[PDB]
Design a protein around this motif. Sequence first.
Motif, mmCIF file in Angstrom:
data_model
loop_
_atom_site.group_PDB
_atom_site.id
_atom_site.type_symbol
_atom_site.label_atom_id
_atom_site.label_comp_id
_atom_site.label_asym_id
_atom_site.label_seq_id
_atom_site.Cartn_x
_atom_site.Cartn_y
_atom_site.Cartn_z
ATOM 1 N N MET A 1 0.732 -1.182 -0.192
ATOM 2 C CA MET A 1 -0.020 -0.015 0.030
ATOM 3 C C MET A 1 0.857 1.199 -0.186
ATOM 4 S SD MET A 1 -2.448 0.582 3.158
ATOM 5 C CE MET A 1 -0.734 0.984 3.859
ATOM 6 N N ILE A 2 0.381 2.192 -0.704
ATOM 7 C CA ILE A 2 1.211 3.588 -0.787
ATOM 8 C C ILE A 2 0.812 4.496 0.132
ATOM 9 C CG2 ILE A 2 2.086 5.324 -2.331
ATOM 10 C CD1 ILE A 2 2.182 2.982 -4.506
ATOM 11 N N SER A 3 1.592 5.260 0.974
ATOM 12 C CA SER A 3 1.166 6.243 1.706
ATOM 13 C C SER A 3 1.760 7.355 1.621
ATOM 14 C CB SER A 3 1.106 5.864 3.132
ATOM 15 O OG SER A 3 0.974 4.565 3.456
ATOM 16 N N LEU A 4 1.155 8.644 1.706
ATOM 17 C CA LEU A 4 1.879 9.914 1.880
ATOM 18 C C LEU A 4 2.214 10.539 3.071
ATOM 19 C CD1 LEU A 4 0.800 9.492 -0.917
ATOM 20 C CD2 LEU A 4 0.709 11.992 -1.344
ATOM 21 N N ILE A 5 3.484 11.038 3.396
ATOM 22 C CA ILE A 5 3.368 11.755 4.899
ATOM 23 C C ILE A 5 4.010 13.051 4.531
ATOM 24 C CG2 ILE A 5 5.807 10.691 5.188
ATOM 25 C CD1 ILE A 5 4.706 10.470 8.267
ATOM 26 N N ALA A 6 3.350 13.673 5.241
ATOM 27 C CA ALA A 6 3.709 15.397 5.085
ATOM 28 C C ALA A 6 3.022 16.276 5.973
ATOM 29 C CB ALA A 6 2.918 15.878 3.970
ATOM 30 N N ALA A 7 3.663 17.446 6.333
ATOM 31 C CA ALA A 7 3.432 18.577 7.178
ATOM 32 C C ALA A 7 2.858 19.720 6.508
ATOM 33 C CB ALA A 7 4.836 18.926 7.885
ATOM 34 N N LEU A 8 1.762 20.169 6.809
ATOM 35 C CA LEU A 8 1.097 21.402 6.181
ATOM 36 C C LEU A 8 0.864 22.469 6.798
ATOM 37 C CD1 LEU A 8 0.533 18.537 4.798
ATOM 38 C CD2 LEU A 8 -1.721 19.721 3.737
ATOM 39 N N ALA A 9 1.140 23.583 6.429
ATOM 40 C CA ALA A 9 0.754 25.047 7.074
ATOM 41 C C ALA A 9 -0.399 25.435 6.515
ATOM 42 C CB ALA A 9 2.067 25.920 6.758
ATOM 43 N N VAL A 10 -0.639 26.604 6.994
ATOM 44 C CA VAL A 10 -2.108 27.154 6.368
ATOM 45 C C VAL A 10 -2.156 27.082 4.875
ATOM 46 C CG1 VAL A 10 -3.450 29.108 6.138
ATOM 47 C CG2 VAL A 10 -2.253 29.184 8.156
ATOM 48 N N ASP A 11 -3.044 26.798 4.551
ATOM 49 C CA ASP A 11 -3.075 26.730 2.834
ATOM 50 C C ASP A 11 -2.413 25.698 2.144
ATOM 51 O OD1 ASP A 11 -5.375 28.552 2.248
ATOM 52 O OD2 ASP A 11 -3.954 29.916 2.849
ATOM 53 N N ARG A 12 -1.905 24.523 2.717
ATOM 54 C CA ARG A 12 -1.286 23.499 1.958
ATOM 55 C C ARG A 12 -0.056 23.919 1.705
ATOM 56 N NH1 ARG A 12 -3.054 22.555 -2.405
ATOM 57 N NH2 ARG A 12 -4.837 23.772 -2.533
ATOM 58 N N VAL A 13 0.566 24.692 2.314
ATOM 59 C CA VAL A 13 1.795 25.188 2.068
ATOM 60 C C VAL A 13 2.856 24.569 2.721
ATOM 61 C CG1 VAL A 13 3.876 26.756 2.197
ATOM 62 C CG2 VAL A 13 1.622 27.349 1.798
ATOM 63 N N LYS A 109 -3.436 5.986 1.915
ATOM 64 C CA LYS A 109 -3.342 6.664 3.102
ATOM 65 C C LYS A 109 -2.710 7.896 3.288
ATOM 66 C CE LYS A 109 -2.609 3.944 7.061
ATOM 67 N NZ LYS A 109 -3.192 2.438 7.191
ATOM 68 N N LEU A 110 -2.983 8.863 3.956
ATOM 69 C CA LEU A 110 -2.282 10.151 4.061
ATOM 70 C C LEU A 110 -1.879 10.338 5.688
ATOM 71 C CD1 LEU A 110 -4.616 12.347 1.933
ATOM 72 C CD2 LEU A 110 -2.650 11.219 1.159
ATOM 73 N N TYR A 111 -0.794 10.672 5.870
ATOM 74 C CA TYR A 111 -0.490 10.980 7.234
ATOM 75 C C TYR A 111 -0.169 12.496 7.295
ATOM 76 C CZ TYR A 111 0.735 5.890 7.925
ATOM 77 O OH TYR A 111 0.606 4.662 7.977
#
Length: 159
Positions: A1-13, A109-111
């Motif tokens: 399974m592929i998952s994406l992991i990210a940290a988002l600020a206001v606005d998807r930045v 999945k998204l983390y």
Amino acid sequence: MISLIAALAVDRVIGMENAMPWNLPADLAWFKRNTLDKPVIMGRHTWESIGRPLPGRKNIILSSQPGTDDRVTWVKSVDEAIAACGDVPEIMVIGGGRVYEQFLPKAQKLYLTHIDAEVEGDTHFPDYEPDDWESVFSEFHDADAQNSHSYCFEILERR
Ligand SMILES: Nc1nc(=O)c2c([nH]1)NC[C@H](CCc1ccc(C(=O)N[C@@H](CCC(=O)O)C(=O)O)cc1)C2
């Protein structure tokens, strides 16, 4: 399974560590915890940004050019990247932007870590459709002595 992991600020930045105005070690423990013992896929820019392979993870660099570093695996297409992972239960995509875009359609999945912060930045996490994803986990935290800003971890699963 592929998952994406990210940290988002206001606005998807989203942005590079150094580009980050914030300081959240809890966010790093979380990333560490969710990516340890798994393959992580990233693009060139992010690779160079990190500058050392990440330990206890197979590091795959999606790049169009030949690689200049034997400590990681270099691939040239999305499909190659996924084949290079072998048969594992979960593959982790660590960005950057373009990379996020290319894998989202295959991700399950998204983390995401939502940070209570406005910042001007060049890039954004791809716009994903909320009706298509289920929030199965969420946990907000106030800032503190270690953590500069408030933040919220969330895990969604594609429906
Ligand atoms: N949750 C989350 N937060 C982020 O800041 C980012 C994402 N995801 N995903 C994409 C990206 C990757 C940035 C990035 C940069 C450095 C290290 C790093 O040093 N990781 C160590 C943590 C060090 C420690 O935990 O003490 C690790 O081994 O994972 C990790 C991620 C930035």
